[PDB]
Structure 1
Amino acid sequence: SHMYYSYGNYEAFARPKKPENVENKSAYLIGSGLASLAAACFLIRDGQMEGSKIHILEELPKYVVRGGREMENHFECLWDLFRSIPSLEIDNASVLDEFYWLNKEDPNYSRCRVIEKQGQRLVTDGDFTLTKTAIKEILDLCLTNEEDLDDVKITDVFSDDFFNSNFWIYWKTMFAFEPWHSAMEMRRYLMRFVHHISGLADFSALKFTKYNQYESLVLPMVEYLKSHGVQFEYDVKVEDIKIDVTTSQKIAREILIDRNGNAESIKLTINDLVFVTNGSITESSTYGDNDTPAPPTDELGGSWTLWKNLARQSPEFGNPDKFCQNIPKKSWFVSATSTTNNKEIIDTIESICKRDPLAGKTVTGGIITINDSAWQMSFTINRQQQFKDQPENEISTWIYALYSDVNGDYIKKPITECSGNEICQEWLYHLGVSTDKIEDLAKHASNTIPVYMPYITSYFMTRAIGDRPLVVPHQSQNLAFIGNFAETERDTVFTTEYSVRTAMEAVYQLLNIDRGIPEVINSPFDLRVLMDAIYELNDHQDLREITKDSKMQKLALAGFLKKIKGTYIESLLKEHKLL
């Protein structure tokens, strides 16, 4: 009870007092990821901790696109943070100001979503094509308690009708689900993005940065932190943190680090806070080129080794083996990015996405799903250029495939065995380019850089409660867990919001900052949102059309409309066009 959830404008603009004894506190932060830098910015801003007392420990010494960085308006903790962060492109404005102004003048929306048979758009695009049984299973999943879904796969809760629907095609590609993933984590997405079901197929509710998130989010935060004098230590490899787990309290006592190849230790008091980003989804990422495949691997890196060393000291520090071990070989492993300036590939893209890729505006609106591909290939093109020095005549696309062990259509090899051009070979095949000019474009007019992330589907692995540590574990004094693998309430992993939210909850609990953490948006608990979900899920159908065939449901519906005739409920029903 060191924190409380709040919402509205009262706690949003309120600044908290400087919490007690902060001037004698220090903070050690492992990693320089999004969650780590977010916690460093909260300590400077809300904790009012001076910059010399904050230490950032980074592994590394002092064109690839990491796609999937969808954002929406209700990332409450992200915009709380990216308010005081000054931007690096325009003056006298924040990172939110650029993000707000850019997404209001160029709204993001996709005029094409799913293509099949080598170029043709899907005929049932836009519709969800969910059967009544399929919608029933969606409601049953949402109505099951989270504690009852321990180690439950997606296939354990859904049937054949749901997976054959266009809803699952949109769902499995936006968020990169697999059928063997966590039902808890899918249930969280259903509750979190229930207010965006209308803007699900066409990506109207998605918001994107001007560039990649490294330069749009991380670099502004790095510059903000360095302006406050935050100490950055480089070439520091953290082996483990000595935790003494007593019957009454847990303190991080000492951190064993490898500073520039020299193994030595930093001592800790109860005042010296430690923020741990347990796990990493980009760890041990091998790279390739247009000529050679990215070599597969499963070597555990520093972030996973740190969690495995911490998990031994206490059972409520989590089970990293539920995520980093026994990842199915069919799962998403290989992502590719392709940079080209060839005109007829762009024209082939323009024939599908109905927009000019070199225009400097929204190009694809999001991702394009190849339905007929055995790889389940999906590709996206963001607002070109995504990079500062990228020439204005070049576009950069991002290609990933969900299934990995299956042979492709144009190339009878798995994605893990395909080189950079061979990924671009099949990508041009499913765009409708003929089988004659396809080979020389990928090999000579295109440059494709594959990357093999072995842990890119870790956060969606089937888990039980307690497999992920709490953001601040029970009875903990200076140890906090942040990042996508730290357990918090009702929020959803693999979002930039979740890493920032866990950063905010950790700083607020450890420092006892008296300000409400903005809760996850109350979309599932809103009558208006739930009424829009019912209308959208059964393909824009009124209550009379939903129950037009079943006699029992129509009878209860007929009685219900008698009891609400000429009432405020009926006006709600009409104005959400459910009548």
Structure 2
Amino acid sequence: SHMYYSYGNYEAFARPKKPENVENKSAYLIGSGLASLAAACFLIRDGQMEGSKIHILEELPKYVVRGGREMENHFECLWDLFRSIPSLEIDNASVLDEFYWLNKEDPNYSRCRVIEKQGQRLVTDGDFTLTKTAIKEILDLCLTNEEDLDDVKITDVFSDDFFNSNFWIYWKTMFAFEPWHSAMEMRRYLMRFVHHISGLADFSALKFTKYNQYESLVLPMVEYLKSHGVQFEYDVKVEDIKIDVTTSQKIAREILIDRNGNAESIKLTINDLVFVTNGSITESSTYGDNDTPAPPTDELGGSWTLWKNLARQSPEFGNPDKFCQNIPKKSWFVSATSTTNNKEIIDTIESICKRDPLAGKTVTGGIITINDSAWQMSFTINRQQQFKDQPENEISTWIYALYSDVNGDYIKKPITECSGNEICQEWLYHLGVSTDKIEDLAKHASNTIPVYMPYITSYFMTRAIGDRPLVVPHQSQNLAFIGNFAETERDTVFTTEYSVRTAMEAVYQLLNIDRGIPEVINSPFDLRVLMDAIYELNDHQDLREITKDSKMQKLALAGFLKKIKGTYIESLLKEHKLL
């Protein structure tokens, strides 16, 4: 046991000893992603490794919004990391200090969630409209083991009652889930955010940064790492890492890189740690403009080629083909972001979200789902402005579509064939804007940049156990896997927390840092949390109202209330407004 999980304030504020033999250890980190930079920060702080021994290998040499970066308070590893990171906006404060102070003065909540029939709000908005069978299937999915859910789709565990409910409309749009996605990952998502079911439709439990994650999270970490002398090597293309797999131990021996076009090799010892971010969801992302579509592609990038080369060496390094291959053509591929300063587009937006987009505060509270759209278009507007040099009179909205190969409503073309204005054409169509001024507002009054990510749905692909390698593989001495494609316990991918948690576990295991890693929050194992979930799932109903029709549950409930009458259980039932 090279690590142990923990919770509470004891292991939270505790600093570990400097681990043994660190001063003769180095670290090479492939990529400059969020998980890679988090691992370097943990090596500096918790591992007490000097910055000159840490190398960041970056492929690239020395307005687009990557939306969907929702955050919540129980990102235990993220706030453990973003504590010693000083901020760049205000002095004598951390990244968490600004995030705490900004989310307490302007709480995030959505006054409108789903609209349909070109602008009109959904009549059953706020309610989940989950039937008894839909709630049963939700419980059945959570009560099934993770081992029994290997290569199981969402449609294999849910019926047509679940998909017709408003709960699925919120769930499929908040997390960009698809019906052909992993049931293991969805089951992890239901258990992780079971305490946010009350704040699910109105987004009251969601927390947002002042800007995008690049300048709110990545840039503060870059400034922190550069202050400690962390070496950043650029123009480095990592082909493959030579691993010798013996029956007793596995050591990274050598890395083949392409340093500024010249292929050369770095030698490795047992002390020289290697951190690999296998796979990438932003790789091979073609871009478009307001007049031409983003060209579709399926070219495997550097991150996917490295994982394929590593997987051939050992079977327990994971299967990269289960994520980067055979992605359905109906999956989410194209996302667009539109920037405008035109008044009547903003006025239409204000008429739907009931808040001023130029006020500088929470605008939409999150995303807005177009239920009638054939593309399953969903758009969001964050606290404008999300950028530094962006003018104060301009707003930036982010648009993504779930289905890809279906013709749109106003434009009879798929999202893959529509240019930047044409995506903005149908977006204005569903906002209630008339079909006469719709054309010139997109082509001239707004600038929309499409982007085609062919791997933006890879983390939710159906997988088995062992398809994702362990964060530190078994019997591994200096090789670690970080990012959203590394296997850990009970955590949800496509979150900033998952990348940070994998970074923390990799550093703590390889360096044998004897400090408790903060476990995933115990909401699914909490009596109070599970009771609040039952109340919220069936549209704010007491136990008498939930079982008012079924006789088998009514008899069982009557015996239950008889045995708990005048007890602390009944007090728990009443204070959670279930009785």
Provide, for residues 490-513 of structure 1, a one-character-per-residue CA deviation record: whole Å limited to 9, x for no partner.
000000000000000000000000
User: Matches of 1:121 and 1:299 in 2, distance apart?
Assistant: 41
Secondary structure of 1:323's aligned partner: helix
User: Matches of 1:31 and 1:234 in 2, distance apart?
Assistant: 10
Aligned length: 579
Provide, for residues 311-335 of structure 1, a one-character-per-residue CA deviation record: whole Å limited to 9, x for no partner.
0000100000000000000000000
User: Matches of 2:247 and 2:68 in 1, distance apart?
Assistant: 43
Secondary structure of 2:450's aligned partner: strand
Provide, for residues 113-136 of structure 1, a one-character-per-residue CA deviation record: whole Å limited to 9, x for no partner.
000000000000000000000000
Q: CA deviation at 1:366?
A: 0.2
User: Matches of 2:98 and 2:166 in 1, distance apart?
Assistant: 34
Q: Does 1:185 align with 2:191?
A: no
User: Matches of 2:226 and 2:138 in 1, distance apart?
Assistant: 47
User: Matches of 2:96 and 2:180 in 1, distance apart?
Assistant: 36
User: Matches of 1:506 and 1:221 in 2, distance apart?
Assistant: 18
User: Matches of 1:223 and 1:130 in 2, distance apart?
Assistant: 47
Q: CA deviation at 1:262?
A: 0.3
Q: Does 1:381 align with 2:381?
A: yes
Alignment of 1:462-473 (within 5 A): 462-473=462-473
Secondary structure of 2:300's aligned partner: coil
Provide, for residues 190-227 of structure 1, a one-character-per-residue CA deviation record: whole Å limited to 9, x for no partner.
00000000000000000000000000000000000000
Q: CA deviation at 1:178?
A: 0.3
User: Matches of 1:53 and 1:559 in 2, distance apart?
Assistant: 66
Secondary structure of 1:242's aligned partner: strand
User: Matches of 2:505 and 2:475 in 1, distance apart?
Assistant: 15
Indicate the residue corresponding to 1:499 in structure 2. 499
Indicate the residue corresponding to 1:52 in structure 2. 52
Provide, for residues 213-249 of structure 1, a one-character-per-residue CA deviation record: whole Å limited to 9, x for no partner.
0000000000000000000000000000000011111
Provide, for residues 469-521 of structure 1, a one-character-per-residue CA deviation record: whole Å limited to 9, x for no partner.
00000000000000000000000000000000000000000000010000000
Indicate the residue corresponding to 1:418 in structure 2. 418
User: Matches of 1:273 and 1:255 in 2, distance apart?
Assistant: 12
Secondary structure of 2:263's aligned partner: strand
User: Matches of 2:556 and 2:210 in 1, distance apart?
Assistant: 51
Provide, for residues 249-295 of structure 1, a one-character-per-residue CA deviation record: whole Å limited to 9, x for no partner.
10000000000000000000000000000000000000000000000
Indicate the residue corresponding to 1:527 in structure 2. 527
User: Matches of 1:447 and 1:560 in 2, distance apart?
Assistant: 61
Q: CA deviation at 1:568?
A: 0.2
4+ runs deviating over 6 angstroms: none
Secondary structure of 1:484's aligned partner: coil
Provide, for residues 524-561 of structure 1, a one-character-per-residue CA deviation record: whole Å limited to 9, x for no partner.
00000000000000000000000001111101101110
User: Matches of 1:80 and 1:559 in 2, distance apart?
Assistant: 46
Q: CA deviation at 1:338?
A: 0.1
Secondary structure of 1:103's aligned partner: helix
Secondary structure of 1:481's aligned partner: strand
User: Matches of 1:557 and 1:191 in 2, distance apart?
Assistant: 25
Q: TM-score, normalised by structure 2?
A: 1.00
User: Matches of 1:553 and 1:144 in 2, distance apart?
Assistant: 22
User: Matches of 1:569 and 1:240 in 2, distance apart?
Assistant: 58
Secondary structure of 2:400's aligned partner: strand
User: Matches of 1:385 and 1:195 in 2, distance apart?
Assistant: 30
Q: CA deviation at 1:83?
A: 0.1
Provide, for residues 390-419 of structure 1, a one-character-per-residue CA deviation record: whole Å limited to 9, x for no partner.
000000000000000000000000000000
CA RMSD of aligned residues (A): 0.3
User: Matches of 2:553 and 2:192 in 1, distance apart?
Assistant: 28
Secondary structure of 1:241's aligned partner: strand
Q: CA deviation at 1:443?
A: 0.1
Indicate the residue corresponding to 1:307 in structure 2. 307
Secondary structure of 2:444's aligned partner: helix
User: Matches of 1:162 and 1:560 in 2, distance apart?
Assistant: 28
Provide, for residues 137-195 of structure 1, a one-character-per-residue CA deviation record: whole Å limited to 9, x for no partner.
00000000000000000000000000000000000000000000000000000000000
Secondary structure of 2:11's aligned partner: helix
User: Matches of 1:513 and 1:550 in 2, distance apart?
Assistant: 54
Indicate the residue corresponding to 1:221 in structure 2. 221
Provide, for residues 21-53 of structure 1, a one-character-per-residue CA deviation record: whole Å limited to 9, x for no partner.
000000000000000000000000000000000
Q: TM-score, normalised by structure 1?
A: 1.00
User: Matches of 1:217 and 1:242 in 2, distance apart?
Assistant: 33
User: Matches of 1:280 and 1:10 in 2, distance apart?
Assistant: 35
User: Matches of 1:379 and 1:250 in 2, distance apart?
Assistant: 47
Indicate the residue corresponding to 2:5 in structure 1. 5
User: Matches of 2:552 and 2:345 in 1, distance apart?
Assistant: 55
User: Matches of 1:124 and 1:95 in 2, distance apart?
Assistant: 38
Indicate the residue corresponding to 2:347 in structure 1. 347
User: Matches of 1:258 and 1:483 in 2, distance apart?
Assistant: 22
User: Matches of 2:5 and 2:124 in 1, distance apart?
Assistant: 42
Provide, for residues 75-117 of structure 1, a one-character-per-residue CA deviation record: whole Å limited to 9, x for no partner.
0000000000000000000000000000000000000000000
User: Matches of 1:552 and 1:388 in 2, distance apart?
Assistant: 61
Secondary structure of 1:461's aligned partner: coil
User: Matches of 2:151 and 2:354 in 1, distance apart?
Assistant: 43
Q: CA deviation at 1:456?
A: 0.2
User: Matches of 2:275 and 2:477 in 1, distance apart?
Assistant: 12
Secondary structure of 1:417's aligned partner: coil
User: Matches of 2:89 and 2:556 in 1, distance apart?
Assistant: 59
Provide, for residues 2-21 of structure 1, a one-character-per-residue CA deviation record: whole Å limited to 9, x for no partner.
00000000000000000000
User: Matches of 1:73 and 1:552 in 2, distance apart?
Assistant: 39
User: Matches of 2:403 and 2:560 in 1, distance apart?
Assistant: 47
Instruction: Compare 552-561 and 259-268 and name the one that shifted more.
Output: 552-561
Q: CA deviation at 1:72?
A: 0.1
Secondary structure of 1:456's aligned partner: coil
Q: CA deviation at 1:381?
A: 0.2
User: Matches of 1:100 and 1:556 in 2, distance apart?
Assistant: 45
Provide, for residues 345-398 of structure 1, a one-character-per-residue CA deviation record: whole Å limited to 9, x for no partner.
000000000000000000000000000000000000000000000000000000
Indicate the residue corresponding to 1:212 in structure 2. 212
Secondary structure of 1:184's aligned partner: helix
User: Matches of 2:285 and 2:326 in 1, distance apart?
Assistant: 17
User: Matches of 2:385 and 2:545 in 1, distance apart?
Assistant: 46
User: Matches of 1:556 and 1:442 in 2, distance apart?
Assistant: 60
Tell me, which stretches of 5 or more residues in structure 1 are unaligned?
none
Provide, for residues 441-481 of structure 1, a one-character-per-residue CA deviation record: whole Å limited to 9, x for no partner.
00000000000000000000000000000000000000000
Secondary structure of 1:553's aligned partner: helix
User: Matches of 2:496 and 2:448 in 1, distance apart?
Assistant: 26
Secondary structure of 2:171's aligned partner: helix
Secondary structure of 1:442's aligned partner: helix
User: Matches of 1:553 and 1:9 in 2, distance apart?
Assistant: 41
Indicate the residue corresponding to 1:490 in structure 2. 490
